[PDB]
Structure formats: C-alpha cells, structure tokens
Structure 1
Amino acid sequence: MGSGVLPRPCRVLVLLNPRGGKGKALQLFRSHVQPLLAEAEISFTLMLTERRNHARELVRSEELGRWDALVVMSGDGLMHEVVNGLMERPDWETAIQKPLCSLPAGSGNALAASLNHYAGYEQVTNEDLLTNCTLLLCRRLLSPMNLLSLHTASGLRLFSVLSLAWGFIADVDLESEKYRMRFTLGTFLRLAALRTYRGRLAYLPVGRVGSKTQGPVDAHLVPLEEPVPSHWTVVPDEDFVLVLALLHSHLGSEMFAAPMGRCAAGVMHLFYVRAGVSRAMLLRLFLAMEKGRHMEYECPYLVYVPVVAFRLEPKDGKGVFAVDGELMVSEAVQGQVHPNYFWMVSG
C-alpha cells in the first residue's frame, strides 16, 4: 500500500499555526503529538506561522536537505500554502518531492480526514483524528498524491491539494466565521434562501487521447480566451447550485463526499448539482454525505464524473470560489491534474 518510507530515525520540520483549534494547536501538539514522536525516534523543530503568506515564504526559502519531512499542523489552508511555496521555488522539481505530513488542528481538515480513511481507520474527529494522523507519521509510510494546477482569468497560476468549489459550497465556506460544526449551520441557513449560480462548465473525462493541444506545463489546457478543445464535454445546463472538483475522499472530517473509490494517478472527482433540486433533497444529500451514502439516492440533479481537467466560467461578472477552503474571486478558472506529484505520509 505504501510507496515509500521516511528513514528511522529522522528529523522533521513542524509548521504550526497557534491560532488553530480555537488557539490550542500548540497545546494539542504538546499533549497529543510530541509524546508519540519521542517513542518513534522522530526529532522535530516547531516553527510558528500565523500571519498571511508566512509559511509560504519560509518554505520557499528553506534548505530542504536538513529535513526528512515537513509536517503541517493546522488545516487544509496551511498545506495549501506549503505546497504553493514549494512549487514557487526555482528548484520546484526536487523541492516538491519532500514528504509532507498533514496533522489536523483547526477546522477544514479534509486532507487529514481522507488520509485517515485511506489508512483504514474509522471516520474519527478532533483529537482522535489528530492521534490517528500522528500514528501514520510514526509508521513512516509514504504515498504519492495528485496536484491540481489552476489558472484564473486575471492570469494567476496556483496549486490545489484538495478541492476547488463554486456556488453553494463556496458561499458557505465564506459565510462561516465560527469555531463550532459551522458547515452544517452554514448549509442550513444558506439553504433557506437557496440560490442558483449561472455559469459555463466544461471538463475532460478520463477518456482523453494519444495527443493533445514556471512550474510544469498544463498540456491539456488552452488559454481561457480560446474555447475548450472539441473533445471535451461542455455541460448544457448553465444554472448550478454547486460545482466541486475534489482530489480526495473527504470534503471535511465528517463529509465522505467521494465513496466511489480513491482517485487514480492524474484523475480527480468532479461533482456538480444542476439547478432544480429541492432544499430538502440538498439537505438529505448533505446529511447522507456523513456516511458516504448520498450517491445511493440516484438524484438526477447530482452529477459525478472522473476528470483530468475542467473549465468553469461565471457568467455575471466575478464568481466566488473556495480553493482548498480559502477564498478566491475570479471571472474564470480552469485546471488540470498532475499525477502523483508530491508525497505524503499515509498507511
């Protein structure tokens, strides 16, 4: 199952956002993570990272040869910054090979949840999740993971380790400003005055061909001013409640969003919900997501397709998106998956 190993013994850089877990991330490290590292012969150094772009800048400038792995203790948002930091480096090709480890603290631990799931553990939460992911780090097994490369109409190129979400899910990620979960509460009250979002979706299903038409090159993508290649699927409906590109099984620690198996190399999940669902059905799909049972409804407004690339354009000025949980505003976004691009600890 594992495709690599950390050395025993090893030393490990821990980037921690102390404002995580309602400001208890460091305490949680001390109580839950530290004692397990001692037993596993894993040395570490803690570097605190709270301000915007801080962890990005550290990782961009780091000498990576002193570390066997970078462990990231916060949420999906920190991993995001770390991965972009590495990819922004002139030596990205080798820098992106540094094993990464996700230890869940805050909220938005979809990555950590997915890995916990891949390893065969129960869908545990909070401190139990933190303990399980630490145990993965202690066991030292490594797996390669897909990376999402994204382009935006303004010309920004960035990377996504987990998800790009638009519409309902994006609106709720933003509408949330809480500790506690805030997603259920946010979903519930956005459900009240449900809205649809007008946009154009195109994607490239795992049925791609023998040929195709500063980081890696996005060979599947053409400029946003050009139409998508003719072998893509353009979605006919232009009214959505949500679109979701997801690289892993979980959208959140208790959201088993992708129960059809784990993604193959270079493949990501694409979900969209067409305009026309009832509030009740949306909520039912939401709550079934906890046990990964939502696909069992065979709801005709919910579409799943495995893809390697997509394009999404609203359609009424700018749209709000969530990239690995962080806010992003754009006129249009497209992306493609790069296969097995970085390594992570997981059993």
Structure 2
Amino acid sequence: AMGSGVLPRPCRVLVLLNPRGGKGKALQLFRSHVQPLLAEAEISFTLMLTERRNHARELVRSEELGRWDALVVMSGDGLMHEVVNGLMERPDWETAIQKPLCSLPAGSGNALAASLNHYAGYEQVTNEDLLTNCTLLLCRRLLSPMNLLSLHTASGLRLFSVLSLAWGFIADVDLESEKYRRLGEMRFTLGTFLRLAALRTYRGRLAYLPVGRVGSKTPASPVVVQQGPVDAHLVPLEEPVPSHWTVVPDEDFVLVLALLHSHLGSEMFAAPMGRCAAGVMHLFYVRAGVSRAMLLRLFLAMEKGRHMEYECPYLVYVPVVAFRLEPKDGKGVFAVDGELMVSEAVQGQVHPNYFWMVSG
C-alpha cells in the first residue's frame, strides 16, 4: 500500500492534545515519545490542549487552516471524531476536510491508530510502542485518503464517523467497559466476558446496499441535507429502503457493526479480509442463535484476526456502501467511533477518500 501524497519537508503541525489521555499522561508522553522524533524530522509544532466536550470541534471549526501542513490529534478515536466533524461543519468544508490529519494514540480507544499501524506493515503493538510507530509514520510524512461515513439519525441529526457504528453486543461492551479504563486494553476483555455471561439479543431491522449492487441510478428524492455532501444512496427514514437494497430477513441480532478500518482496538483485528476500497466499508452482523461458547471463540480469535476462519454460520460479513438499522421497541443505543448515541433509527453511506491521513 503506497502513499498517495506527502507532507512537505520541513513542515509545521498543530497538535491537539487531550491532557487527560493515557491516564493523564498524554503531555508527558508527547514530550518523551513524540517531540524528539519531530525534531529530527524537521516537523515544527504547536501544542493546543483540548479536554472539554466540543472544544476541539469548535477550535477546528474556526481555525485558519492555511497556517498548518497537518493537524495531529493526540488522544484517541473520540478526538479524531470531533476534529473531522468540526472540519465538515465549516462553510468551506470541501477544502477544509482535505487538510491532512494524523492520529497519535494516548491511552485506550485507538482503533484508528492501530489500523494505520497495521496498514504500514508493523506488528500489532500497544501503548508506547504504538505511539512510537504512529509518530514514525508522521516523520515519514506519507499520506493516504480515507473513507468517511455519513450518518443520519431519526431526530434528523447528520453526523460523520471515521471508524465505526456499532449496535447490540459491541455497543454494550463499550458501556460496560468505560468503568475499567484503568485496565487499559484488558477492559474490553472484561466487558466482553461480562456481557457474554449475561448474553442477550436485540430486535431490529437491518438493510444495506452491497457494493456490487450499486447501479447507475440513485433514488429520485434522497435525504435532504443542510450542507453537502449529498447522501445520494439514502432516502428518508420515513420511506422504505430502495428495492435494490438487501433487507436482512432475520430481525434478531447479537450485534451489528459497520467498520471502516481493520481494527476495533489495538488488540482487535476485526476485519482481516483486506483494506476497504474507496467508498466501501465492512458490515458485520451476528444473528441470534450463536452459543455463548462460539461467540467467546470468535472474540478470542479476533486478536490475531482468525475469527473468520471458524466460518460461523451466525456471523455475516458483507462489503457495503450504505446501510439502515432500525431497532424494534423504542430507541437503541449505538456506539459511533466509540461514543454513546441513542436513537430510534440510523442510516449511513460511505463517502470515498474524503480526508487524508498520514500513514505508511
């Protein structure tokens, strides 16, 4: 996987850092593991600290982007989510979203970083090693375009996702996990085991548009969007999905996962079938009926990306460009790039190669 662009040498970057990350050690880690590499690479930087809710989002929304060669985001997937949404909320979003971005991991919730490390051909590492590897990619300066997920909720909120949308088991493991950050990446194992022992299924309606079913025509009247891009594949949540979509017959699920990248976490190689093409994401779902033992084995095999070798009949994988998910029985709880989100229904479509990341 070759680069499709490069940062100039020398260059200067804005570092948005959350000082609470890495158990309050992010700034220390920047000084010890990032700064010295940046110096040898002739990367000049400015540190801006962002910890409060929508602060990084607001900062990026108002920034004079022409003074920077890239924005480096040092915290986790959540902060990247904010930065990308900030960029897309601007009136000049079509040029702003083209400013290269870089993810440097601090603490847990670094799926994006873990994905990029994997794509560069590094071993699956965590903590300091991951941070060093991701800094090395920044120092090598190569860029690659990345897909972007546009999401619509039943309340009419339109938002963007850089990594994932999860519902059911996976989202519940996030809720259970948060109270064990102290354990680092072990917290997902704990959360998973707990939820496995108390396994439940979720009622809902899933439809999607697989890649090979995309034609030359889109729906006559798609969803109305305040600011572009237009989600041409999507029709309003009040209308049925177009007839060329697949509507899953099964309405009972253990989980649904839309995933743009290889990794769900630094020790979770969820999508080993290869890097998504431009405008495509991974869709997984698990149908009710799997045993707790088989789910356990799928989870344990995920670390090495071997879970698909089981050929579990309850696990379905399809490459898609769009999906719709409607939980039955009131609102469902979703995780979007690791963050909680509750809604009666969500749908989304992938936009091809919309932003640029430093990567190997």
Q: Structure 1-normalised TM-score?
A: 0.99
Q: Which residue of 2 aligns with 1:181?
A: 186
In 2, are the aligned partners of 1:212 and 1:220 still within 8 Å (CA)?
Answer: no
CA–CA separation in structure 2 for the residues paired with 1:283 and 1:16:
36
In 2, are the aligned partners of 1:164 and 1:322 still within 8 Å (CA)?
Answer: yes
Task: Say what the alpha-carbon RMSD is for the aligned residues.
Answer: 0.8
Shift of residue 129 of structure 1? 0.2
In 2, are the aligned partners of 1:212 and 1:219 still within 8 Å (CA)?
Answer: no
In 2, are the aligned partners of 1:15 and 1:71 still within 8 Å (CA)?
Answer: yes
Show CA shifts across 1:289-339 (max 9, x none).
Answer: 000000000000000000000000011000000000000000000000000
Q: Which residue of 2 aligns with 1:205?
A: 210
CA–CA separation in structure 1 for the residues paired with 2:122 and 2:195:
32
Shift of residue 172 of structure 1? 1.1
**Identity fraction in percent:** 100
Shift of residue 178 of structure 1? 3.6
SS in 1 for 2:283: strand
Show CA shifts across 1:100-146 (max 9, x none).
Answer: 00000021100000000000000011100000000000000000000
Shift of residue 29 of structure 1? 0.4
CA–CA separation in structure 2 for the residues paired with 1:109 and 1:178:
17
Show CA shifts across 1:236-280 (max 9, x none).
Answer: 000000000000000000000000010000000000000011111
SS in 2 for 1:316: coil
CA–CA separation in structure 2 for the residues paired with 1:202 and 1:107:
32
CA–CA separation in structure 1 for the residues paired with 2:67 and 2:217:
40
Shift of residue 208 of structure 1? 3.0
CA–CA separation in structure 2 for the residues paired with 1:165 and 1:235:
17
CA–CA separation in structure 2 for the residues paired with 1:210 and 1:79:
32
CA–CA separation in structure 1 for the residues paired with 2:179 and 2:80:
21
- Greater shift, 131-140 or 207-216, is seen at 207-216
Show CA shifts across 1:209-253 (max 9, x none).
Answer: 443330200000000000000000000000000000000000000
Shift of residue 181 of structure 1? 1.4
The alignment status of 1:71 with 2:84, answered yes or no, reads: no
Q: Structure 2-normalised TM-score?
A: 0.95
SS in 1 for 2:199: coil
Q: Which residue of 1 aligns with 2:26?
A: 25
In 2, are the aligned partners of 1:309 and 1:335 still within 8 Å (CA)?
Answer: yes
Q: Which residue of 1 aligns with 2:165?
A: 164
SS in 2 for 1:181: helix
Q: Which residue of 2 aligns with 1:285?
A: 298
SS in 2 for 1:335: strand
Shift of residue 192 of structure 1? 1.1
In 2, are the aligned partners of 1:259 and 1:292 still within 8 Å (CA)?
Answer: yes
Q: Which residue of 2 aligns with 1:335?
A: 348
CA–CA separation in structure 1 for the residues paired with 2:129 and 2:293:
32
SS in 1 for 2:82: helix
SS in 2 for 1:201: strand
SS in 1 for 2:209: strand
Q: Which residue of 2 aligns with 1:190?
A: 195
Shift of residue 16 of structure 1? 0.5
In 2, are the aligned partners of 1:88 and 1:215 still within 8 Å (CA)?
Answer: no
In 2, are the aligned partners of 1:148 and 1:337 still within 8 Å (CA)?
Answer: yes
SS in 1 for 2:178: coil
CA–CA separation in structure 2 for the residues paired with 1:25 and 1:281:
38
Q: Which runs of 5 or more residues in structure 2 are unaligned?
A: 219-226
1:226 equivalent among 227, 235, 239: 239
CA–CA separation in structure 1 for the residues paired with 2:44 and 2:118:
26
CA–CA separation in structure 2 for the residues paired with 1:212 and 1:286:
39
| Number of aligned residues | 347
Shift of residue 177 of structure 1? 2.4
CA–CA separation in structure 1 for the residues paired with 2:52 and 2:214:
44
CA–CA separation in structure 1 for the residues paired with 2:301 and 2:82:
31
SS in 1 for 2:197: coil
Q: Which residue of 2 aligns with 1:84?
A: 85
SS in 2 for 1:207: helix
- Greater shift, 271-280 or 169-178, is seen at 169-178
In 2, are the aligned partners of 1:150 and 1:159 still within 8 Å (CA)?
Answer: yes
CA–CA separation in structure 1 for the residues paired with 2:228 and 2:59:
19
Where in structure 1 do 4 or more consecutive aligned residues deviate above 4 Å?
none
